[PDB]
Amino acid sequence: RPDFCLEPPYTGPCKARIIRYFYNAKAGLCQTFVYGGCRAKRNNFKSAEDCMRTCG
């Protein structure tokens, strides 16, 4: 599993409120988190399918 898949979700400095998906290792699946709108890290997906395919 890629290392960026083990990093915690990164909200970012921007203050938009955008719901994204991230792979939660502790849980073993993709969950949603609030993305600020800029400077997204890799563990940030627009859908669960992409998240599960990439980090699953």
Binding site: P13, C14, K15, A16, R17, I18, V34, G37, C38
Partner: protein
């Protein structure tokens, strides 16, 4: 939510709008019956504008729902540095202005540091308000070394405690009845030595007027 803030008196911020694409994701300001100003990092190909709102989760009766026809971000927007984080939105049709839906004035000039301003946004989900001063540019630059441009301004308190947060971006910072800032970014929210950074609107009045007239 806006930390250290207070619930705004019902419809006391009539220029405030909600940007919706299935759910609330950003704020905005109505500068005229057909144009809204917000942040460029709030961009989405399809946006619905909701005006006359207080409780964002309940249909209260005075709300107007209008789809955006044109979304124009500043040609010099940088998604990494966030310089020129401003965007203009033209509505599908002109809205009905009333006591619950009104426009806010563009700045006459750039407000000086120390000027007390009102920040608002949503983060029942009611509109939140916050009274905070424009901070000196040197205090801003010192909080975010090498990250502040001439198009940004810091508003808030260097001791944290009060700040705008996620869900507020694009929202207004009104000082003396003039729109002087747009909620943009910061490191965390209400963090000491890290006050919110906002887009300095006085630097864009001409761009704003030129764009509106041409569209």
């Amino acid at each position: 939510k806006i930390v250290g803030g207070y619930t705004c008196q019902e419809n006391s911020v009539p220029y405030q709008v909600s940007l919706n694409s299935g759910y609330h994701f950003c704020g905005g300001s109505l500068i005229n019956d057909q144009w809204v100003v917000s942040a460029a990092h709030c961009y989405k190909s399809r946006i619905q504008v909701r005006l006359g709102e207080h409780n964002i989760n309940v249909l209260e009766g005075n709300e107007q729902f209008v789809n955006a026809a044109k979304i124009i971000k500043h040609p010099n927007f940088d998604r990494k540095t966030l310089n020129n984080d401003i965007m203009l939105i033209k509505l599908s049709s002109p809205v009905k202005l009333n006591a619950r839906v009104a426009t806010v004035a563009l700045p006459s000039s750039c407000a000086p540091a120390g000027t007390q301003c009102l920040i608002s946004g949503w983060g029942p989900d009611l509109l939140q308000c916050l009274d905070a001063p424009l901070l000196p540019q040197a205090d801003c630059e010192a909080s975010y070394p090498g990250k502040i441009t001439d198009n940004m301004v810091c508003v808030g308190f260097l001791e944290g405690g009060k700040d705008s947060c996620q869900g507020d971006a694009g929202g207004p910072v009104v000082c003396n009845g003039e729109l002087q800032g747009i909620v943009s970014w910061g490191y965390g929210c209400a963090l000491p030595d890290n006050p919110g950074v906002y887009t300095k609107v006085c630097n864009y009045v001409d761009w704003i007027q030129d764009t509106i007239a041409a569209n």
